[PDB]
Design a protein around this ligand. Structure first.
Ligand SMILES: *CC(=O)Nc1cccc([C@@H](OCCN2CCCCC2)c2cc3nccc(C(=O)O)c3s2)c1
Ligand SMILES: [Mn+2]
Length: 299
């Protein structure tokens, strides 16, 4: 049976007045978005920050991902070093060869349907690479920053100072007595179901490239998801602590939905934000070559 797409999560298109600061805006949409776990935010059309990464020196060794590693229960090691350009050439070549069509012509529903088929397939072993958890301290943030390590044009200063610049999000949690991370995706590269440390918010910006497909669960269903996950996880992993079990928490959203867990989806396109709410489980995969930046923040 083919994959059944979950219902779409909320998308907000704030006016320039509503777009003044993200913390106030997120607070206002909370009564709705908290009930879906994730939401998408489309900035005004004229809000277009420039890409400020040091592309000439951008080099990384992505992690290798075998889509059916869990159902299939011979080592592929992270030895291939890429540049942004060489990874993109590999990524586009992989996708165009896999689907036998230009990368921009593959429907998002088809990649989604094929991703979940491959995750459970025992006869077909598809292996991809993900440039995940690249620190913005290594080659700079995708957003312009007033660091002095790179030049900022006068038309770019407003983005260096914008509250929607992920480098300007509040990250200090209140108690008695962090930098954004970068993600260089390719088709089928993915992240498993998880929540954030300290049940923190997270905000995610797709700088460019093909969409990032998300799945989200509202926080009121967090314990229901955890029960389903442990009931259906392999018995060898069933008793592992949450922080370790999250390393293998691959699960088809339809399986969660069949067990009563509400799940929402979205395709995050270039230039759009995705916000995850406290204790909102989320997962996803990339439709193709793209570049994302993310940070956890607190209210
Ligand atoms: C099962 C599995 O392998 N899951 C997986 C794979 C790759 C990367 C990640 C995870 O990266 C760790 C997050 N990082 C920052 C926070 C502290 C721990 C280290 C990812 C988590 C998210 N969350 C939202 C979006 C994305 C994304 O766009 O890739 C990711 S990646 C988990
Ligand atoms: Mn996350």
């Amino acid at each position: 049976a083919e994959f059944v797409p979950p219902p779409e999560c909320p998308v907000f298109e704030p006016s320039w007045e509503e777009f003044t600061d993200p913390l106030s805006f997120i607070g206002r949409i909370r009564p709705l978005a908290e009930k879906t776990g994730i939401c998408k935010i489309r900035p005004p059309k004229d809000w277009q920050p420039p890409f400020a990464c040091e592309v000439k020196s951008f080099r990384f060794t992505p992690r290798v991902q075998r889509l059916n590693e869990l159902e299939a229960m011979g080592f592929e090691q992270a030895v291939r070093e890429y540049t942004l350009q060489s990874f993109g050439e590999m990524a586009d070549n992989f996708k165009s060869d896999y689907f036998n069509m230009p990368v921009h012509m593959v429907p998002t529903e088809l990649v989604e349907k094929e991703f979940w088929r491959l995750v459970s397939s025992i006869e077909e072993d598809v292996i991809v690479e993900y440039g995940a958890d690249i620190s913005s301290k290594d080659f700079g943030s995708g957003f312009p920053v007033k660091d002095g390590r790179r030049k900022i044009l006068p038309e770019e200063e407003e983005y260096a100072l914008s509250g929607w610049n992920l480098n300007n999000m509040p990250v200090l949690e209140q108690s008695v007595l962090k930098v954004p991370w970068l993600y260089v995706g390719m088709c089928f590269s993915s992240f498993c179901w998880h929540i954030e440390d300290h049940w923190s918010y997270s905000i995610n910006y797709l700088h460019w490239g093909e969409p990032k497909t998300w799945y989200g669960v509202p926080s009121h269903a967090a314990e229901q998801l955890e029960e389903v996950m442990r009931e259906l996880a392999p018995e060898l992993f069933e008793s592992q602590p949450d922080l370790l079990h999250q390393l293998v928490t691959i699960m088809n959203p339809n399986v969660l939905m069949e067990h009563g867990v509400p799940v929402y989806r979205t395709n995050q396109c270039a230039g759009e934000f995705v916000v995850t709410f406290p204790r909102a489980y989320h997962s996803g995969f990339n439709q193709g070559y793209n570049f994302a930046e993310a940070v956890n923040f607190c209210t």
